[PDB]
Amino acid sequence: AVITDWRPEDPAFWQQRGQRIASRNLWISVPCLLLAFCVWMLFSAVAVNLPKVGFNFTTDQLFMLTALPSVSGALLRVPYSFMVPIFGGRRWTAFSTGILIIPCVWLGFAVQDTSTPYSVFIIISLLCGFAGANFASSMANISFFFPKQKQGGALGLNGGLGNMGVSVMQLVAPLVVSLSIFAVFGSQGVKQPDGTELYLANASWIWVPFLAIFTIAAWFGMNDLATLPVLKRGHLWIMSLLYLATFGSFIGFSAGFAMLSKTQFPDVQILQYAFFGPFIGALARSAGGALSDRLGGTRVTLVNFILMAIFSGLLFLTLPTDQGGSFMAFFAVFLALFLTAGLGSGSTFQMISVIFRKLTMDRVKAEGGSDERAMREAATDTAAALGFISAIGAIGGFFIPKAFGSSLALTGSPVGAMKVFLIFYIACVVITWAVYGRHSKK
């Protein structure tokens, strides 16, 4: 039922009923969020296979389809974070998971109809973006179920396994598309040059039964708990760039890596390999957080950004001047980018929760605030900041595939976009060096 008496900080309460309830909510939240990341990056897999079905959209148009869900995603993250305390975690989780069936079902029918206008795919693309907003509400919700000591571990597991949703989708979708399942629901195949049949509808339809099962499980298994001037702070905008360069890079490369590989090395079936990128990136986010706890987020973030810049530079030497070579180098460097982008995602996030909380602490104390008020306002501000940072960092998921699409459109080469990425990474190691010299000497 709806919980009125929730005392997670009380050890006796936690041992008695708190831990068991919070364990159940967390472990229904994780699959629900994982599925959100599946639906969010759907077009990273589908847009690769649209020409194979009969669509004649330009390369720039295809990239745009992978880019757009990060727009609505970013925009809706701040509103989504406000929804949980209003409607409760259980109800909003079920609602925000369930509505993802609409673009999943729609896209399945849409890909079988080569008369479907590009405009309709734009709508579906944006609709998939709703899935990208679930992160803000899912994470906000889980924080209330855990004591401040265990939130770090609880939020890390929910977000970590959540981000795994990209890789599992980029693994499963290419596999079920070759399968003749869902025929009873009208799954029609398209004959490919190699003789095999392509069932593109399966790529989105495969999630519908799982979206439904955990929509049901959310309504029956989760609970509701009865229990900003941050924009002005210059540090908020400073940190947002860093999370933009890391999480934005992870989610941006996830959106457009397959599409790019198709434009650089068209022979390689990238879809049987691409998932590994977002896979290690999602694992490195957890690694990045763990390292940051032991050594300090800033130190981890700084070294990571130097690494992002190096591999950003090395990526130029892998590209073909269309002929020729080398894919194996190209993929290796991109794995390194995924890993560092993920690593930096976790490190930056830990860093923001530390730096912003510390400066908030020192501020209210400087105003003559009590220790009690200092701690709680530091909690409000950091929770408010991270939510806003997370929304801004999401826009990188648009920028990178949009930059690849534009660079190729006017030059025929992605190096223009990559050069922009390199400068951004070099700017970031400068930024991160600055905060290491003023705000973080620990």
What sign does the dihedral 248-252-254-257 (CA atoms) show? Answer: negative
Residue owning tokens 């706890």:
293
Which residues does 328 contact at the CB level (< 8 Å), separation at least 6? Answer: none
Look at the block and give the residue holding tokens 């980018």: 337
294 annotated among ligand-binding-site residues: no
Measure the CA–CA gap between 203 and 181, rounded to whole angstroms: 11
Token couple for 153: 């571990």
Rounded Cα gap, residues 201 and 363, in angstroms: 55
- Which of 135, 192, 186 minimizes the C-alpha distance to 161? 135
Residue 390, annotated ligand binder?
yes
Angle at 325 (CA atoms; ends 319, 329), nearest 5 degrees:
70
Whether residue 158 is annotated as binding a ligand: the answer is: no
Distant-in-sequence, close-in-space partners of 168: CB < 8 Å, separation ≥ 6: 34, 38, 275
Report in angstroms the alpha-carbon separations of 363 from 50, 204, 369, 438, 440. 54, 49, 9, 15, 15
Does the annotation list 49 as a binding residue? no
How many angstroms separate the CA atoms of 380 and 378, rounded?
A: 6
Closest CA to 436 of 371, 351, 372: 351
> With contact defined as beta carbons under 8 Å apart, do 381 and 230 qualify?
yes
**3-class state of residue 274 by DSSP:** coil
Q: Give me the amino acid identity at 372.
A: E
Q: Please, which residues have CB within 8 angstroms of residue 215's CB and are 6 or more apart in sequence?
A: 94, 97, 98, 101
CB atoms within 10 A of CB 335: 17
Contacts of 141 (CB under 8 A, 6+ apart): 25, 29, 84, 89, 92, 93
Residues flagged as binding site for nitrite? 77, 243
Residues flagged as binding site for nitrate? 77, 163, 243, 390
Residues flagged as binding site? 77, 163, 243, 390
